Ligand binder design. Structure first.
Ligand SMILES: *[C@@H]1O[C@H](CO)[C@@H](O[C@@H]2O[C@H](CO)[C@@H](O[C@@H]3O[C@H](CO[C@H]4O[C@H](CO[C@H]5O[C@H](CO)[C@@H](O)[C@H](O)[C@@H]5O)[C@@H](O)[C@H](O[C@H]5O[C@H](CO)[C@@H](O)[C@H](O)[C@@H]5O)[C@@H]4O)[C@@H](O)[C@H](O[C@H]4O[C@H](CO)[C@@H](O)[C@H](O)[C@@H]4O[C@H]4O[C@H](CO)[C@@H](O)[C@H](O)[C@@H]4O[C@H]4O[C@H](CO)[C@@H](O)[C@H](O)[C@@H]4O)[C@@H]3O)[C@H](O)[C@H]2NC(C)=O)[C@H](O)[C@H]1NC(C)=O
Ligand SMILES: *[C@@H]1O[C@H](CO)[C@@H](O[C@@H]2O[C@H](CO)[C@@H](O[C@@H]3O[C@H](CO[C@H]4O[C@H](CO[C@H]5O[C@H](CO)[C@@H](O)[C@H](O)[C@@H]5O)[C@@H](O)[C@H](O[C@H]5O[C@H](CO)[C@@H](O)[C@H](O)[C@@H]5O)[C@@H]4O)[C@@H](O)[C@H](O[C@H]4O[C@H](CO)[C@@H](O)[C@H](O)[C@@H]4O[C@H]4O[C@H](CO)[C@@H](O)[C@H](O)[C@@H]4O[C@H]4O[C@H](CO)[C@@H](O)[C@H](O)[C@@H]4O)[C@@H]3O)[C@H](O)[C@H]2NC(C)=O)[C@H](O)[C@H]1NC(C)=O
Ligand SMILES: *[C@@H]1O[C@H](CO)[C@@H](O[C@@H]2O[C@H](CO)[C@@H](O[C@@H]3O[C@H](CO[C@H]4O[C@H](CO[C@H]5O[C@H](CO)[C@@H](O)[C@H](O)[C@@H]5O)[C@@H](O)[C@H](O[C@H]5O[C@H](CO)[C@@H](O)[C@H](O)[C@@H]5O)[C@@H]4O)[C@@H](O)[C@H](O[C@H]4O[C@H](CO)[C@@H](O)[C@H](O)[C@@H]4O[C@H]4O[C@H](CO)[C@@H](O)[C@H](O)[C@@H]4O[C@H]4O[C@H](CO)[C@@H](O)[C@H](O)[C@@H]4O)[C@@H]3O)[C@H](O)[C@H]2NC(C)=O)[C@H](O)[C@H]1NC(C)=O
Ligand SMILES: *[C@@H]1O[C@H](CO)[C@@H](O[C@@H]2O[C@H](CO)[C@@H](O[C@@H]3O[C@H](CO[C@H]4O[C@H](CO[C@H]5O[C@H](CO)[C@@H](O)[C@H](O)[C@@H]5O)[C@@H](O)[C@H](O[C@H]5O[C@H](CO)[C@@H](O)[C@H](O)[C@@H]5O)[C@@H]4O)[C@@H](O)[C@H](O[C@H]4O[C@H](CO)[C@@H](O)[C@H](O)[C@@H]4O[C@H]4O[C@H](CO)[C@@H](O)[C@H](O)[C@@H]4O[C@H]4O[C@H](CO)[C@@H](O)[C@H](O)[C@@H]4O)[C@@H]3O)[C@H](O)[C@H]2NC(C)=O)[C@H](O)[C@H]1NC(C)=O
Ligand SMILES: *[C@@H]1O[C@H](CO)[C@@H](O)[C@H](O)[C@H]1NC(C)=O
Ligand SMILES: *[C@@H]1O[C@H](CO)[C@@H](O)[C@H](O)[C@H]1NC(C)=O
Ligand SMILES: *[C@@H]1O[C@H](CO)[C@@H](O)[C@H](O)[C@H]1NC(C)=O
Ligand SMILES: *[C@@H]1O[C@H](CO)[C@@H](O)[C@H](O)[C@H]1NC(C)=O
Ligand SMILES: *[C@@H]1O[C@H](CO)[C@@H](O)[C@H](O)[C@H]1NC(C)=O
Ligand SMILES: [Ca+2]
Ligand SMILES: [Ca+2]
Ligand SMILES: [Ca+2]
Ligand SMILES: [Ca+2]
Lengths: 388, 388, 388, 388
C-alpha cells in the first residue's frame, strides 16, 4: 500500500464522546487479565487497538505482588482489541521491555521497546513485526520514551527519547525512523528545559508533542516537529491553565519559555491539542494527586500567556483515580478532518490503595464531536474490597 | 461490494426450527462468561453473530452483584460467534453504552450505542468500526433505542429512538442513516401513542417494526418504514391476540389505533412478522410475568381486529423464564425469500430468582421452516442452586 | 471453487500412525473444557478439525452432573482445531442438537443436527453455515444419524438416518443432499436388518458405510452407496471376525445377509475399510464392554465368510476405556491415493467410572502408513481420582 | 510462492538484543498455561512463533505431577504466538509425540514428531499441516531428533536423527526432505563420535548444526550439511572454550576430532554460530548444572584448537536456572544478511526445585545487533513458593 500523509486539519472540537473503555480491573477480579500500566491507543489502517506495558502476571496471580515497580525483565508492550481487556489469551506481544511507543505508517507498524538495567538500557526498533534497528543508552540513566503512540508522515516517524536525570537537565533526542531504520537524530533544541513521556499527534501543519517536565515545571513542554525537513522546536504551553500533576494553582500569567515553578521532581504524562481557537487541554482535576480528569477549551493556549478556559468537559470525577493520559487519532478514518482522540489511564492499587499488593489500571478513551454532547463521568468501576 | 436491497418476500412460515442457543448461564457457572442482558442476533454477509449489552463483569465475578441495574458506565455492546457464549476472550466490543442497535448494509456494519446520565445521554453512530456521527438527547430523559438489529435498504438504515417519559407521552424519532451519516430524521407520526424497543425486519414491501407501548397499551405498536422515500406510518397490531407482557386476557376485538387498556407503565420488548395470511406473533405465555414463550399464526393480525390463532408453536414452557424477544433475518442467504428468524432472551437471576445477586441471560433463537416440524421447548438450563 | 470428486483408491494400509490426540479430560481437570461425547473428525480443503456433541457445560462445572444423559436441549455439534481440546473459547458451534453429521463437498460444509423430544424430533440441514432444509421425524421415535462425517461426490452428499425402535425393525433412510437441498431419499434396501450410527468413507468405487446393528447382530451391517446414480445396497460384513460390542466370541463362519446372534439390544458405533486384500477392521478388544481398541487386517472381510486376520495393531490397551469409533479421510491431500483414517472416542466417567457424576471423552486418531510402523497404545490419560 | 534459498551471510554480531520472552511460569501460576519442555522458535515468511513439547496438562492442573518424565502419550509439538505463553486456548498442535523438529521452506511448513515406546518409535513427517511420510525406528532404542528448528534450501530440508544408545555408539542419520517426502538419507560420517539434539542454521555456505555428544565429550560435535549435493561432514568445535554441560574446566587446547574427556553420559542441547572472526558460542555459566547462560565471541572456534574469548554477554545469571538452547533465524527478514538468533529454555521445577511435583519452563530469546548494546540478565521470574 502507501505511506500515510498528514493532509488534514483537526476536526472542530465542540465536545468529547465515549470511544472505548475496557473495564479491565472489574473483569480481572474474575478472569485472566494481565496486570498493566502505561497504556495507550493506536490505529492501523484497518483496526484500532489498546496498548500497554504488561507486568507478566495476572491481577489475581500471586506474582501481582510488587507490581508498583516500574522496570523488570517481565514487562512487555502488548496490544489487544479495542475495549476488550488485556487478557493472557487475547494480548499480542509487540516487543519486550519497560518503556515503549508504537505507530503505523500506512504500510506497516513500528514498535519500540526499551529494556535493560538503569545504567545499560537499549531500544530495539521493530518494523512489520521484525527487529530492524537498536539504540544503546547515551547517558546511562534509564533510556526512556513516549508511552503513547508516535506519528508518521510519508514514511517518516519521529520519536522523542530521554536519557539522564529525572530531576535535572537530561539528554533528550528526537529520532526520525523510516521502515525501522534511523534516518537522523537530533539533540533537543528550544526552550523546553526537561522532557518526559511525550504525547504526540499529527496534522497538515506538522507533528505536535505535549510532554512532561519532571524537573521544575508544572506547565507542559511542547515539541513541534516537521517530519519532512526532520527538524523541531520546543517551548512550553504559554497558558496559565497549568496541566501537569501535581501542580500549583492556576495563575493569570503562564510561562512560554521556562518552567512554571512550585512543584519539583514529579509530574504525570499528559497531552493537549493545540490548534488556535480549537485548542483543548487535558488535566487531572486534583492539583495534588492523580485523581479526576477534565478537558478545557483554552483558545490559543500554546501562544497566549493570559489564556483561560471558555468551555470544558469532566471525564473522570475528582473522587476517582486517574493517571497517565495521551493523544492518538485514527489517521485512516473517512472525512475531511482528523478527529482528536485521547485515553486516560485509570490506576488502581498501589500506592493510593494499599490494601492490595498490586498496581494496575484500566483504560477509558474519548474522541471529539462537532456536536455539543452531554457529559458523563467514567470511573474504573472496580471495588477494591473484592480483591481482599 | 454492494449495498443490500430488500428484494424478496418472507418465506412461508409453517413452523419454527432451532437456529442457535448459547447456554451462557450453564457455561458461565464455571467459565469466564460476561454478565449480559438485552441480547439480539444480526448477520453480516459472511457470518451471523450474537449481540448483547455486557455489564463489564463475569457471572462468577464479585462485580456481578447489582447487575439488575440497567444503566452504568461499565456496559457495552458486544458481539460473539453464533451459539458460543459471550466470554471475556471471544467477545468483540462494538461500542460503549447501555442501549444499542446494529445492522450491516451489505458493505459495512453500523452500530449505535447510547451512554450518559439520564438527563444528558448521547448516541454515537459507528460505521465500519469507526465513530462517524453523534446525537445528543433531545428530551433529557434516557435517550434510548431498539435493543435489536436495524435493517438497511440500498445503504439507508432507519433506526427508531425514544427520549422522554416511559410512563406517558414521549418524543420518538425515526433516524435515517447512510454510512453512519444522518440523512434525515422525523418525529413519530400515526396512531401509536408510545414507542419503546422496536424490533424490525425488512422485505420488498419495506421495513416493519413491532414495538412496546410502555404507557397504556398491551397491544403492540407497529411502525412501517419506507426506506426509499424515508417516511413512515404507525398504528397498533389490530388483533385481539395481545402480545405485550404483562397484559390483560385476550378479548375478541382488538385495537388498531389506540392502546388496549388494563396494564400501565410496564411492558417487554417483543416482535412479530406481519405478512397477511403468513402472519406470526410472538408472546410470553404468562400474562403476568416474563415466563414462557410461544409463536401464534394469526392471519392478518395487523389489520383484522377480530383475528385469532389458527396454528402455534411453544418455544419456552411457561415454567421457564423468558424475557426480551426480537426479529432478525439473514438477508444474505441463498434462495428466493427471506427466512424469518427471532431470538428469545432467557433471563436468570434478579428480580425473579433473588437467591443470587446478579441478573444475566442466555439466548435461544429460531428461524422459520416451510415444513411442519415437531416442537420442543428450550429452557435456559442452568440450576440456580449451583451459584449459591 | 470446485466440488470434490472421489477419483482415487485407498492407499495401501501396512500399519497405522498417530494423527491426532486432544487429551481433553487431562486438560479439562484444570481448564474450561466442554463436556462432550460422540466425537469425530472431518476435513475441509484447507484444514482438518475435531467434532463432537457438547453437553453445554464444562467438566469441572457443576452442570457436568448428569451428563451420561444422551439427549437434552443443551447439546450442540461443535468443532475445534485438530488435537486441541474442545474449550469454551475455541469451539465453534455448527448447529444445535443431539445427533449429527457433517462433511465438506469441496466448496462448502454441510452440517446436520437433530433436536427435539423423542416423539417429535427434526433435522436441520446447514450448508455454508446457514440453515437450508429441514426434515421432520417419520417414525416418531428418536430420529437419528451417523455421529461421524458424511462423504460427498460432485456435490452430492449421502447421509444415513434411522427413525424408530432401537431394539427391532426401524425405518432407515438414505438422503442425498446437494448444497443442503434434498435431491432424493430412499428407504433402506438389502439384507441389513437394523442400522445405526453409520461410519462412511469414499473412494473411486463409491461410498462405503459400516454401521451398527443394535437389534440382533454382532457383525456390522454395511451400506454401499453410488452417489452418482443415488442408489445403495446393504448387507453385513461376511467375516467371522466380529466387530460390534458387546459381541460373541469369533466363530469360523460369519454371516453375510443376517445378524450374527448372541447379543441383543446393544452395540457400539464402529467402522471398517473394505478394500479386498487391503481390508482392515476396527473393534474393541473386550467382547463385553467398551474397552481396548485394535485394528485387524482381514482380507476380503466384506465378502468372505471364512476370513481371518493376517496382521493387526493395538491402538488402546484392553485395560483402558474406549468407545465410539468412525472413519474419515483428508480428501484434499496430495498424492495418488486416499489415506484411510479413524478416530476412537475414549469415554471417561459414567457408567464405568461412577465416582464422578459426569460422562465425557477425549479423542485419539490414526491414519494409515505404507510403512510397517512400530505400535504404541493410546490411553485417555486422565486420573479419575483427581476429579474427586 | 517460492522456496527460500540461503543466499546471505550472517550479520556481524557485536552484541545480542532481547527478541522474545513469554514469562510462562509466572503467568501459569494463575492461568491455563500448558506444562512444556524442549522449546524452540521458528519463523514462517509472515510470522515467527514459539514451539515446544506440551505435556498435555496445565501447570496448576493435578496432572502436572510427574512431568519430569520425558516420554508419554500425552505429549505433542505445539506452537503459539511469539512471546505469548503456551496456553490451552492459543496453542496450535503441529503433531503428536515426544521429540520434534519443524521448519518452513518458504512455501509451507514441515513438522516432524516421533512417538512410541522406546523399542518401537516412529517419526511422522507433516507438510502443509498434513501427514506425508513416516519413518520407523532403525535401532529400536528411542528414535529421536533435534528439538529445535530445521533449515531449508530450495525446498530441501535436512534433519538429523539418532537411534540407539545415549551412552555409547549410536546410529545417527541425516535425512533430506522435500515437501515432506524423503529424498535421501545418509548414515553419519566424519569424526563426531556421538550426536544428539542438533541445533542448526543456514547461510550461503550451507547448513551448520551444533549438537550434543552425550557419550564422552564436553566439546560439541558439529555437522556441516550441503543441502544441494545432500552430503555432510562432521567434527567437533576445536576451541578449548567447552560448551556442553556438565563439563570440565576450559583447557588451553581443545579437540577437533574426538570428545574432550572428563564428563560422561550426560549433556545439554546447545548451539553456536560458526563464522570465522564472527563466531559466537553459547553455554551455561555453571560447569556442573543447567544454570546461567552466556554468549562468548571466540574467533575461528570451529577450526582453531587454541581459540579463546575476546568479547561476551551474560544472558542469564548463574544464580538462575537455564536449560536447552538452540538456533533459529528469520530467513524472510529484509536486508542483506541473516540475523543470528537463539532461545534459552528456562527450566523450573524438578529435579532442581523439588518442592513442586512438576517440571516446566519458560522461554527467553535474543537476536544479534551490529551495535554494542548494554546487557541485562533474563530470569524465568517465577517464585516457586507461590506454587506450594
Ligand atoms: C449536560 O452536559 C453539558 C455538556 O457537558 C453540560 O454543560 C457543561 O457544563 C460544564 C460545567 O458547568 C461546563 O464546563 C465549565 O465551563 C467553564 C467555561 O464556561 C463558562 O465560562 C465561559 C467564559 O466566561 C468568561 O468569558 C466570557 C466571554 O463572553 C464572559 O462573558 C464571562 O463573563 C467570563 O469572562 C463562558 O463563556 C461560559 O458561558 C457559556 O456557557 C454556559 C454553560 O456552561 C452558558 O450558560 C452561557 O450562556 C454561555 O453559553 C461559561 O460561563 C469552565 O470555566 C469550567 O472549568 C472551570 O471550573 C471547573 C469546575 O466546575 C474546574 O474543574 C475547571 O478546572 C475550571 O476552573 C478552574 O480553573 C480555572 C482556570 O484557571 C480557574 O479560574 C478556576 O478558579 C478553577 O481553578 C481551580 O480549580 C482547578 C482544578 O481543580 C485548579 O487547578 C486551580 O488551581 C483552582 O484550584 C467548566 O469546564 C461546560 O462548558 C458545559 N458545556 C456546554 C456545552 O454548555 C451541562 O451542565 C449538563 N447538564 C446537566 C443538567 O448536568
Ligand atoms: C409434535 O409437534 C407438533 C408441531 O408443533 C404438534 O402439533 C402442534 O400442537 C400444538 C398444540 O396443540 C398446536 O398449537 C395450538 O394451535 C391452536 C390453533 O390450532 C387449532 O385451532 C385451529 C383454529 O380452529 C378454529 O378455526 C377453524 C377453521 O376451520 C375451525 O374449524 C375451528 O373449529 C375453530 O373455529 C384449527 O384449525 C386447528 O386444527 C388443525 O390442527 C390440528 C392440530 O393442532 C388438527 O388436529 C386439525 O385436524 C387441524 O388440522 C386446531 O384445532 C392454538 O389455538 C393454540 O394456541 C392456544 O392455546 C395455547 C395452549 O395450548 C395457548 O398457549 C395459546 O396462547 C392459545 O390459547 C390462548 O389464546 C387464545 C386466543 O386468544 C384463546 O382463545 C385461548 O383461550 C388462550 O387464551 C388464554 O391463554 C393465553 C396464554 O396464556 C392468555 O394470553 C389468554 O389471556 C388466556 O388466558 C396452540 O398454538 C400446533 O398448531 C400444532 N401444530 C401442527 C402443525 O399440528 C404436536 O402436538 C406434537 N406431537 C406430540 C405427540 O406432542
Ligand atoms: C513393534 O511393533 C510391531 C508393529 O506393530 C509389532 O509387530 C506386531 O505384533 C502384533 C502382535 O503380535 C501383530 O498383531 C497380531 O497379528 C496376528 C496376525 O499375524 C499372525 O498370523 C498371521 C496369519 O497366520 C495364519 O496364516 C498364515 C499364512 O501363511 C499361516 O502361515 C499361519 O500358520 C496361520 O495359518 C501370520 O501370517 C503372521 O506371521 C507374520 O508376522 C509375524 C509377526 O507378527 C512374523 O513373525 C512372521 O514371520 C510373519 O511375517 C502372524 O503369525 C493377529 O492374529 C493378532 O490378532 C489376534 O490376537 C490378538 C492378541 O494378540 C487379539 O487381540 C486379536 O483380536 C486376534 O486374536 C483374536 O481373534 C482371532 C480371530 O478370530 C482369534 O483366532 C483369536 O483366538 C482371538 O480371539 C479372541 O480374542 C478376541 C479379542 O478379545 C475375541 O473377540 C475373540 O472372541 C476371542 O476371545 C495380532 O493382531 C502385528 O501384526 C505385528 N506387526 C508386524 C508388522 O509384524 C512388534 O511386536 C513390536 N515389537 C515389540 C518388541 O514389541
Ligand atoms: C554495559 O554493558 C556492556 C555490554 O554488555 C558491558 O560490557 C561488557 O562487559 C562484559 C563483562 O566484563 C564483557 O564480557 C567479558 O568479555 C571478556 C573478553 O574481553 C576481555 O578480554 C579480551 C581479550 O583479551 C586478550 O586478548 C587481548 C588482545 O588484545 C589482549 O590485549 C588481552 O591482554 C588478552 O590477552 C579483551 O580484548 C577485552 O578488552 C576490550 O574490552 C574491554 C571491555 O570488556 C575494554 O575495557 C578494553 O579496553 C577492550 O576494548 C577484555 O579485556 C571475556 O573473557 C569474559 O568471559 C570470561 O569471564 C566471564 C566472567 O566474567 C566468564 O563467565 C566467561 O566464561 C569467561 O571466563 C571463563 O572462560 C575463560 C575462557 O576459557 C577462562 O579463561 C576464564 O578463566 C573463565 O573460565 C572459568 O569460568 C567458566 C565459566 O563458568 C568455566 O567454564 C571455566 O571452566 C572456568 O571455571 C566476558 O565475556 C563484554 O565483552 C563487555 N562488552 C563490551 C562491548 O565492552 C558493560 O560492563 C556494562 N556496563 C556496566 C556498568 O555494567
Ligand atoms: C504520500 O505522499 C507521497 C509523496 O508524494 C506519495 O508517494 C504517497 O502515495 C502518498 N500517500 C498516499 C496515501 O497517497
Ligand atoms: C441495490 O440497488 C442499487 C440501486 O439501483 C444498486 O446500485 C446496487 O447494486 C444494488 N445492490 C445489489 C446487491 O445489487
Ligand atoms: C468433479 O467433476 C465435475 C463433473 O465433471 C467437474 O465439473 C468438477 O470440476 C470436478 N471437480 C474437480 C475438483 O475437478
Ligand atoms: C530459489 O532458487 C530456485 C532455483 O533456481 C528458484 O527457482 C527459486 O525461485 C528461488 N527462490 C526464490 C525465493 O527466489
Ligand atoms: C505426586 O504424585 C506422587 C505419586 O508418585 C505422590 O506421592 C505425591 O503426593 C503427588 N503430589 C501431589 C501434590 O499430589
Ligand atoms: Ca512537573
Ligand atoms: Ca405495555
Ligand atoms: Ca449389536
Ligand atoms: Ca556431554
Amino acid at each position: 500500500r502507501n505511506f500515510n500523509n498528514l493532509t488534514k486539519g483537526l476536526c472542530t472540537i465542540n465536545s468529547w464522546h465515549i470511544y472505548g473503555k475496557d473495564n479491565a480491573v472489574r473483569i480481572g477480579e474474575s478472569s485472566d487479565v494481565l496486570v498493566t500500566r502505561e497504556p495507550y491507543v493506536s490505529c492501523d489502517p484497518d483496526e484500532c487497538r489498546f496498548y500497554a506495558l504488561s507486568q507478566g502476571t495476572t491481577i489475581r496471580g500471586k506474582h501481582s505482588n510488587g507490581t508498583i515497580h516500574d522496570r523488570s525483565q517481565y514487562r512487555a508492550l502488548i496490544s489487544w482489541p479495542l475495549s476488550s481487556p488485556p487478557t493472557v489469551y487475547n494480548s499480542r506481544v509487540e516487543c519486550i521491555g519497560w518503556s515503549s511507543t508504537s505507530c503505523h505508517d500506512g504500510k506497516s507498524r513500528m514498535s519500540i521497546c526499551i529494556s535493560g538495567p538503569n545504567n545499560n538500557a537499549s531500544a530495539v526498533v521493530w518494523y512489520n513485526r521484525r527487529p530492524v534497528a537498536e539504540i544503546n543508552t547515551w547517558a546511562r540513566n534509564i533510556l526512556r520514551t513516549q508511552e503513547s503512540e508516535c506519528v508518521c508522515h510519508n514514511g517518516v516517524c519521529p520519536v522523542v527519547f530521554t536519557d539522564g536525570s529525572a530531576t535535572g537537565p537530561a539528554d533528550t533526542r528526537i529520532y526520525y525512523f523510516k521502515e525501522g531504520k534511523i534516518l537522523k537524530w537530533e539533540s533537543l533544541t528550544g526552550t523546553a528545559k526537561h522532557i518526559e513521556e511525550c504525547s504526540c499527534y499529527g496534522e497538515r501543519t506538522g507533528i505536535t508533542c505535549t510532554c512532561r517536565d519532571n524537573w521544575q515545571g508544572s506547565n507542559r513542554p511542547v515539541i513541534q516537529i516537521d517530519p519532512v525537513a526532520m527538524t523541531h522546536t520546543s517551548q512550553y504551553i504559554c497558558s496559565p491553565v497549568l496541566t501537569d500533576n501535581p501542580r500549583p494553582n492556576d495563575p493569570n500569567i503562564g510561562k512560554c519559555n521556562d518552567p512554571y515553578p512550585g512543584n519539583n521532581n514529579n509530574g504525570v504524562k499528559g497531552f493537549s491539542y493545540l490548534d488556535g481557537a480549537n485548542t483543548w487541554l487535558g488535566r487531572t482535576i486534583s492539583t495534588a494527586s492523580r485523581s479526576g480528569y477534565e478537558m478545557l477549551k483554552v483558545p490559543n493556549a500554546l501562544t497566549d500567556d493570559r489564556s483561560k478556559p471558555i468551555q470544558g468537559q469532566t471525564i473522570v470525577l475528582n473522587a476517582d483515580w486517574s493517571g497517565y493520559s495521551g493523544s492518538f487519532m485514527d489517521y485512516w478514518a473517512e472525512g475531511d478532518c482528523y478527529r482528536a482522540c485521547f485515553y486516560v489511564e485509570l490506576i488502581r492499587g498501589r500506592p493510593k490503595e494499599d490494601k492490595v499488593w498490586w498496581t494496575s489500571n484500566s483504560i477509558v478513551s474519548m474522541c471529539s464531536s462537532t456536536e455539543f454532547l452531554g457529559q458523563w463521568n467514567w470511573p474504573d468501576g472496580a471495588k477494591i474490597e473484592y480483591f481482599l
